[PDB]
Amino acid sequence: MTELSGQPPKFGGSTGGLLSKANREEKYAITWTSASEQVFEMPTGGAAIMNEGENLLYLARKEQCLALGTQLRTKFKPKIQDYKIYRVYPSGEVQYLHPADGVFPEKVNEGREAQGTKTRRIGQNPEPVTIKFSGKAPYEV
Amino acid sequence: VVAFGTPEKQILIEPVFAQWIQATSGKALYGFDVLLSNPDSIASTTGAAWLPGWLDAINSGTNSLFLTIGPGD
Amino acid sequence: AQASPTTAGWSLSVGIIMCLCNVFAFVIGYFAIQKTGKGKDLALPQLASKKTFGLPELLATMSFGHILGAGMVLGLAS
Amino acid sequence: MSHSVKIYDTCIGCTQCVRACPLDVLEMVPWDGCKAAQIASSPRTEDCVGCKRCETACPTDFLSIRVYLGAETTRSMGLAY
Amino acid sequence: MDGLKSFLSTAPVMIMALLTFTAGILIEFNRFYPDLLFHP
Amino acid sequence: MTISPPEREAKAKVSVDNNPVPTSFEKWGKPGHFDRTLARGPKTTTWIWNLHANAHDFDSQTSDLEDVSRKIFSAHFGHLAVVFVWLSGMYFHGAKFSNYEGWLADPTHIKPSAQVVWPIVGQGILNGDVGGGFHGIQITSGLFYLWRASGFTDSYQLYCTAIGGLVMAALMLFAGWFHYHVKAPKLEWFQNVESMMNHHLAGLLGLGSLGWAGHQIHVSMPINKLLDAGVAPKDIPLPHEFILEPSKMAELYPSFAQGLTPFFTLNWGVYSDFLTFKGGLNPVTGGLWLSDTAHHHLAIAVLFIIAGHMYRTNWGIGHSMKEILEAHKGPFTGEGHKGLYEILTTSWHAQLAINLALLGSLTIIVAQHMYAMPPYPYQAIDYATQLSLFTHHMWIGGFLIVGAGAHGAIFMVRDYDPAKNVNNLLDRMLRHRDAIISHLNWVCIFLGFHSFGLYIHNDTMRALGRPQDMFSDTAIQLQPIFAQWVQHLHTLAPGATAPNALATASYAFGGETIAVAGKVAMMPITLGTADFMVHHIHAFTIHVTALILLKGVLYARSSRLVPDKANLGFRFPCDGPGRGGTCQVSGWDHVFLGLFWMYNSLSIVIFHFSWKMQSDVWGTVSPDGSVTHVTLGNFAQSAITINGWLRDFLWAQAANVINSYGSALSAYGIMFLAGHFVFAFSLMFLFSGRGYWQELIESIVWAHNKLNVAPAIQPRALSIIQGRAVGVAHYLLGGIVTTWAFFLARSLSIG
Ligand code: CLA
Ligand code: CLA
Ligand code: CLA
Numbered sequence A: 001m002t003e004l005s006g007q008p009p010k011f012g013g014s015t016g017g018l019l020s021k022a023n024r025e026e027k028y029a030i031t032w033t034s035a036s037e038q039v040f041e042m043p044t045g046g047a048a049i050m051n052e053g054e055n056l057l058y059l060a061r062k063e064q065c066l067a068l069g070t071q072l073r074t075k076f077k078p079k080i081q082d083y084k085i086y087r088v089y090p091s092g093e094v095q096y097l098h099p100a101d102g103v104f105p106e107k108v109n110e111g112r113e114a115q116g117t118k119t120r121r122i123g124q125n126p127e128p129v130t131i132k133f134s135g136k137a138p139y140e141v
Numbered sequence B: 001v002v003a004f005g006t007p008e009k010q011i012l013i014e015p016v017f018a019q020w021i022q023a024t025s026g027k028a029l030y031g032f033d034v035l036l037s038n039p040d041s042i043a044s045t046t047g048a049a050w051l052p053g054w055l056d057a058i059n060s061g062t063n064s065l066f067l068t069i070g071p072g073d
Numbered sequence C: 001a002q003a004s005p006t007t008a009g010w011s012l013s014v015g016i017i018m019c020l021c022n023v024f025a026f027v028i029g030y031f032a033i034q035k036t037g038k039g040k041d042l043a044l045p046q047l048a049s050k051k052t053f054g055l056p057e058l059l060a061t062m063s064f065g066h067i068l069g070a071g072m073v074l075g076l077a078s
Numbered sequence D: 001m002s003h004s005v006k007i008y009d010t011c012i013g014c015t016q017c018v019r020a021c022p023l024d025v026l027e028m029v030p031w032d033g034c035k036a037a038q039i040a041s042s043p044r045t046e047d048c049v050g051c052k053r054c055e056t057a058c059p060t061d062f063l064s065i066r067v068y069l070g071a072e073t074t075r076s077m078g079l080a081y
Numbered sequence E: 001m002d003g004l005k006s007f008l009s010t011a012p013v014m015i016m017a018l019l020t021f022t023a024g025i026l027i028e029f030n031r032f033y034p035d036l037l038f039h040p
Numbered sequence F: 001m002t003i004s005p006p007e008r009e010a011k012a013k014v015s016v017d018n019n020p021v022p023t024s025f026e027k028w029g030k031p032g033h034f035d036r037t038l039a040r041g042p043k044t045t046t047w048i049w050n051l052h053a054n055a056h057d058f059d060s061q062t063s064d065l066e067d068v069s070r071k072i073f074s075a076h077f078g079h080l081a082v083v084f085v086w087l088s089g090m091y092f093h094g095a096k097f098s099n100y101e102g103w104l105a106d107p108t109h110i111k112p113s114a115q116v117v118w119p120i121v122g123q124g125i126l127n128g129d130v131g132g133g134f135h136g137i138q139i140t141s142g143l144f145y146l147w148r149a150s151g152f153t154d155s156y157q158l159y160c161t162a163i164g165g166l167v168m169a170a171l172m173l174f175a176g177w178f179h180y181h182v183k184a185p186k187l188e189w190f191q192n193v194e195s196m197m198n199h200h201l202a203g204l205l206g207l208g209s210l211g212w213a214g215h216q217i218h219v220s221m222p223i224n225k226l227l228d229a230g231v232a233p234k235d236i237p238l239p240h241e242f243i244l245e246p247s248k249m250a251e252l253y254p255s256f257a258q259g260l261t262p263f264f265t266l267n268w269g270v271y272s273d274f275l276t277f278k279g280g281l282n283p284v285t286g287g288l289w290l291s292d293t294a295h296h297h298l299a300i301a302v303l304f305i306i307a308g309h310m311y312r313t314n315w316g317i318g319h320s321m322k323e324i325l326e327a328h329k330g331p332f333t334g335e336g337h338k339g340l341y342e343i344l345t346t347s348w349h350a351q352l353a354i355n356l357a358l359l360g361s362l363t364i365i366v367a368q369h370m371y372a373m374p375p376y377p378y379q380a381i382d383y384a385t386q387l388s389l390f391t392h393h394m395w396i397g398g399f400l401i402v403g404a405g406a407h408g409a410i411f412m413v414r415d416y417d418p419a420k421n422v423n424n425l426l427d428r429m430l431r432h433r434d435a436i437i438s439h440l441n442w443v444c445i446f447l448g449f450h451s452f453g454l455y456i457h458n459d460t461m462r463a464l465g466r467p468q469d470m471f472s473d474t475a476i477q478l479q480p481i482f483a484q485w486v487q488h489l490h491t492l493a494p495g496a497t498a499p500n501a502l503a504t505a506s507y508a509f510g511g512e513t514i515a516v517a518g519k520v521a522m523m524p525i526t527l528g529t530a531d532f533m534v535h536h537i538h539a540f541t542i543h544v545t546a547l548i549l550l551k552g553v554l555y556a557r558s559s560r561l562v563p564d565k566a567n568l569g570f571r572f573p574c575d576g577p578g579r580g581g582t583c584q585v586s587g588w589d590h591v592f593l594g595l596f597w598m599y600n601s602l603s604i605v606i607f608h609f610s611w612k613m614q615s616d617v618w619g620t621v622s623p624d625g626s627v628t629h630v631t632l633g634n635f636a637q638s639a640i641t642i643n644g645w646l647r648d649f650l651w652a653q654a655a656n657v658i659n660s661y662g663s664a665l666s667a668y669g670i671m672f673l674a675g676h677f678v679f680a681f682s683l684m685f686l687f688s689g690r691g692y693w694q695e696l697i698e699s700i701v702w703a704h705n706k707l708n709v710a711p712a713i714q715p716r717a718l719s720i721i722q723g724r725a726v727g728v729a730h731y732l733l734g735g736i737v738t739t740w741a742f743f744l745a746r747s748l749s750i751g
């Protein structure tokens, strides 16, 4: 995780940015390398200017960072597939979030452990009466 | 049909079935003469101690005991 | 009790008021019009200050001169 | 807290759910149950909001990915404050 | 032509045509024989 | 290769494609051709509804801005054709199915009537006796008044107008066909906004009022002067007889003896015989002075023709709108209007939003101006005509405004480029939309508490037997001090701040009580605590509608909840039950809520107008001069509580609509019940959800499968967005039809 680098995008300010949560609870960071100084849509409203080289941006939510990432990788002449998304805690602790193992999740990758897997169809879930007075629902067993 | 000033063209269905039921309990207003509305009936020739009072109540139009009904009902 | 208008145009309404307003409008147009000479229809031999810089400029500033002059005449006419 | 995102064995490995997911809850992992040799996975359901884009995307006769909404957190409620 | 026929045969055109035919029938039948509350 | 004319370029900025789209009937037989998703084939009944929902969505149909512009141009032609057919039908019904000549002969003792019902199934009772042995439906459009003001006398003139309207409709239709299929103007042609604006200000508005001033001076004014003197319509010479005999014009207006010389020599004063500035109303008819209106249209022609010169086209002089826009930028707004000229020349939805907003505002202005300055003869005598036109123009304006919000949101979704909008007005408004919307929200709450809350306080105080603690002119007064001051300034204008004005612009501001026949045409309209409260109710409802719609536009791109909403489109149900539920986040859904709130606002506006005019304006004047108003001046003490509005306004004045059976107004009570029904019906769509209905369709489809009658186009419940569209459409229709019946019956029953 270590330290995060990058220049803040050229921007004059919005009311849609971070609130007290960013300092009190959690925040998110997205870094990306751009080939030139180009305008992009700020997920919190408005147009901002990304700089050639490295860019670090702080956003309020993980979904905002991921929307910016999709915009970077889908709306730019040389596509930007270089962005990394981190969760930043007020303790200074930084947590790397996206893309998990260096590879976008849309494509398969070795060394990934299946989670949420159910070895049956939907129609093979047990009857709730068979599990009542436990704490479980038919998908949790 | 009432708006255009011809209220005589209303489809007015007489609730014959509920009136007939009222007659079976003694309501003579409709003249169906069935069961308790017919003195000759075996249902009314029983000497039931309640029958005079029940008939007297149900055949006076002064209470809410089987209110008379019509097409509105 | 309406607004009285000079009664007949004769020598006062014309020239002394209308031509002067057209002249001063032509001056302010030659002073302040941006695209002075580039209309679809061009102007005949320039010489003086009428068709010296395009039929469009001349016509527009003459229209404005008649605006100024009508205003002046109706106003001073009380 | 978080919602629950289950992936069933009718998965055909088309990955459309992963592409639809706007919070990176899902991944593709190798499998041998389908021709695509891959199955969807939900290793980050703590970020899942429950917008159901994956289910909208799933092609299999009744979904092979199922989102059951559960305990609500500020991450799951999509809160930026 | 064939396109004009296929358009005049569409569902809204045909349903409005049949509704118009039936309305003409009912309106005229009530014109010549009004106020039929029941059969004599 | 259809009918090919020569050229007609005129060495101009014209640039057309000779024949891009060929004419054929085959795509008529393929419903759904304009959408790729529908050209395949209907598998579910949804395909059907979509076929109507995307018919005019030309953007989603093709990506060529030029083809969209040509489609819009030809559709404008077809729309003008439809409106021409409508107006020609109006004139035809006035010609061959109206008592216009009988009305013209005796307007006071007769009622305007067109449309004769056919005597069948008892509907012949709708042909009420309007006067002079004529039996029909009384019209509140006020067509007869516009026709008398125009100078109509015979039915054959109206018939000629109807024939001409049909011909003009055929002209517009052919023009649309020719300009989409044959000579189709290129995209570069539509983008000449300076040329278009110069022409519309000079040729459309200016020349229009110029020609109408000519007609009013030559036809309307002399015929109306002869009608107001009682010469009878059969004795007044035809309109052209005044052009053929200038002596007949000089005998009515001696100014016509001096000819055109006062015009060309600026001797305008002698034109005082027909170019006047009186101000008030005609004593004989209660309308505006037609000489005042002729002079008005003349000055409007002058102003608009002059204004048609500011913009630059081909000759260098004029203004570049892009220059004027780019010049305006201050220390608070970065680059100001840099980039607005580009979006207002490549986006149709931007122009559409602006134009809908301004046109709705203008129609509201038209209602509020035509009620208090009745421009047509005998209009103010007909309280039904007055109220009807007022409420109609109100509703039209409100709908156009809601559409303006809709297309602002559509522009934001579809035509917004952040690269073309950097640190300008649009960018900074998006960058502080949270501030904007939060403050508008606070203003809305403050207005709701301090308008409706006053009504609730008054209801509670009066119920408790505490009238001295109420808000009213007799207790805690809330006097509309500023409006009263402006009324007083208006009253003192003629002879003072308006020297050359003989009378006040509108007697609603004060002065004498102008009365024609037994009724009062117009009199001062006092303002008090009740008026204060109703006006602040109006402020509150307008601000809430604006809040909804502005929020819809400003967040159509994104929100803190849905950051990628722009990708979801203008119109979509939601983005899931997650994030707590995200129902109705789209711009479309904001339009959907704004529809209800505009309905609320305009219902209150028209109720206020009706009650105030019946209480403090309309009524009967006596030969002594005593004014007995329609509802006896009950506004000041009743309109301050909600129970007052429920009893003395609704319940009291609903007595005519409910007792309308067995009379000519029975259709009004029928439509009253009908509107109530449709309003109730809408609540099923608005209160429920698609899942239940689809599951019920499952069992119904099973019953069809049981007897082998299942259809190949599978029945599907209405989509979420469609459920709401049906709900709001039926809500608005039911409520508006209810109040339409209420207003028409009440106003026609009060004589
Ligand atoms: C939905 C229920 C309903 C029903 C029960 C009725 C019933 C009736 N209405 Mg009513 N009405 C309704 C709804 C209803 N209405 C609504 C919603 C409205 C508001 C628009 C009205 C408003 C209304 C008005 C204004 C009037 C009526 C009238 C009538 C009567 C006229 C009947 C008639 O002779 O017509 C026509 C009779 C026919 C037989 C037509 C059918 C002919 C077919 C096409 C030919 C088929 C024959 C076939 C070949 C024979 C084969 C035989 C076989 C054994 C081989 C009738 C009893 C009229 C009246 O005066 O009431 C007395 C009248 O004026 N109604
Ligand atoms: C024998 C006595 C008689 C008399 C005095 C009249 C008199 C009249 N009728 Mg009538 N009619 C009659 C018999 C009579 N009809 C019969 C026996 C029927 C049953 C078929 C009808 C059905 C009928 C209809 C449906 C209409 C008239 C109409 C008219 C009026 C216009 C006449 C016309 O041809 O214009 C134009 C005629 C028509 C538009 C329709 C002609 C009627 C034919 C027979 C039916 C064609 C309809 C078609 C099969 C399905 C409808 C589709 C639609 C697109 C046309 C006229 C005053 C019209 C009207 O009321 O004007 C508003 C009209 O629409 N009548
Ligand atoms: C014989 C006349 C004729 C023919 C056969 C065509 C043929 C065609 N036109 Mg065209 N057009 C015409 C007249 C005609 N048009 C006129 C009069 C106008 C001026 C309004 C236009 C303007 C025009 C535009 C802008 C467009 C077309 C398009 C098309 C193609 C799409 C098919 C279609 O329209 O779907 C079927 C249509 C119908 C069944 C029409 C039903 C009635 C509609 C829904 C409303 C009627 C309003 C009416 C036009 C207004 C005046 C009526 C009033 C007098 C009562 C098609 C091959 C479209 C295209 O390019 O396709 C991609 C397109 O965008 N036309």
Ligand code: CLA
Pocket (backbone or CB within 6 Å): F072, F073, F076, F077, F080, F189, F190, F192, F193, F195, F196, F199, F200, F202, F203, F204
């Ligand atoms: C003085 C010239 C002139 C005039 C009269 C008009 C008038 C009009 N334009 Mg146009 N326009 C012009 C120049 C002009 N334009 C130029 C130079 C351009 C290129 C930049 C455009 C491009 C433009 C576009 C893109 C559009 C219009 C549209 C319209 C119509 C919408 C307004 C309306 O509906 O009002 C009321 C309508 C009427 C009163 C109709 C009657 C007017 C008829 C059709 C023309 C007048 C007849 C002719 C001049 C001779 C009669 C007068 C003479 C006997 C004295 C309108 C009739 C819109 C449209 O297509 O509407 C259908 C539209 O989309 N204009």
Ligand code: CLA
Pocket (backbone or CB within 6 Å): F069, F190, F191, F192, F193, F194, F196, F197, F200, F201, F321, F341, F344, F345, F346, F347, F348, F351, F354, F355, F356, F358, F359
């Ligand atoms: C706050 C600023 C402002 C305001 C208040 C308005 C308000 C208005 N404008 Mg305007 N506009 C603005 C900014 C503004 N606009 C700017 C900056 C530009 C330069 C790009 C334009 C250029 C523009 C044009 C060209 C026209 C208007 C017109 C109108 C009026 C339309 C009325 C109507 O819809 O009725 C009915 C509509 C009509 C009678 C005419 C309709 C004209 C067409 C259909 C709309 C314009 C087409 C558009 C330019 C196509 C190119 C865009 C893109 C595809 C390249 C309206 C009152 C129209 C008008 O008539 O002005 C008087 C019109 O012609 N505007």
Ligand code: CLA
Pocket (backbone or CB within 6 Å): F052, F053, F054, F055, F056, F057, F058, F352, F356, F399, F400, F401, F402, F403, F404, F406, F410, F570, F571, F588, F591, F592, F729, F733
């Ligand atoms: C000059 C005005 C104008 C223009 C040209 C447009 C243009 C457009 N609008 Mg818009 N809009 C307007 C006014 C306008 N609108 C108004 C006044 C409102 C407020 C209600 C809206 C709100 C609005 C919404 C919410 C939407 C649009 C949409 C659209 C696009 C699709 C057109 C369509 O609806 O398909 C075809 C039209 C219909 C299916 C209409 C038929 C249903 C009507 C409402 C029933 C009304 C019934 C009748 C009036 C009274 C009842 C009688 C009945 C019993 C017979 C189109 C480009 C849609 C879009 O997707 O934008 C891209 C859409 O989502 N508009």
Ligand code: CLA
Pocket (backbone or CB within 6 Å): F441, F442, F444, F445, F446, F447, F448, F449, F452, F453, F456, F544, F547, F548, F593, F596, F597
């Ligand atoms: C009578 C029905 C009703 C009521 C009262 C409201 C209430 C409100 N709506 Mg709403 N709305 C309604 C119908 C109603 N709506 C319907 C049918 C729809 C569907 C279309 C909507 C959809 C809608 C939208 C989309 C929006 C609103 C908005 C608002 C708020 C506007 C701000 C305001 O007025 O300040 C406050 C006013 C009140 C709270 C009214 C009651 C005040 C009383 C008189 C005082 C009570 C005294 C005391 C508190 C009592 C306490 C009791 C004690 C035991 C504790 C407001 C609270 C807008 C908004 O949020 O604006 C900010 C907004 O965006 N509404």
Ligand SMILES: CCCCCCCCCCCCCCCC(=O)OC[C@H](COP(=O)(O)OC[C@@H](O)CO)OC(=O)CCCCCCCCCCCCCCC
Pocket (backbone or CB within 6 Å): F328, F329, F330, F331, F332, F333, F334, F336, F337, F425
């Ligand atoms: C009775 C009226 C009550 C209102 C008085 C108090 C005004 C409230 C806001 C103060 C600033 C706005 C006035 C200066 C107008 C003005 O433009 O100021 C100047 C400044 C921008 O001007 P620029 O120097 O940029 O001018 C260049 C332009 O070309 C920009 O394109 O505006 C702003 O600072 C942004 C804030 C405006 C948004 C504030 C509006 C808030 C809504 C309040 C509505 C009140 C209702 C009024 C009744 C009609």
Ligand SMILES: [Cl-]
Pocket (backbone or CB within 6 Å): F462, F638, F641, F643, F644
């Ligand atoms: Cl009260």
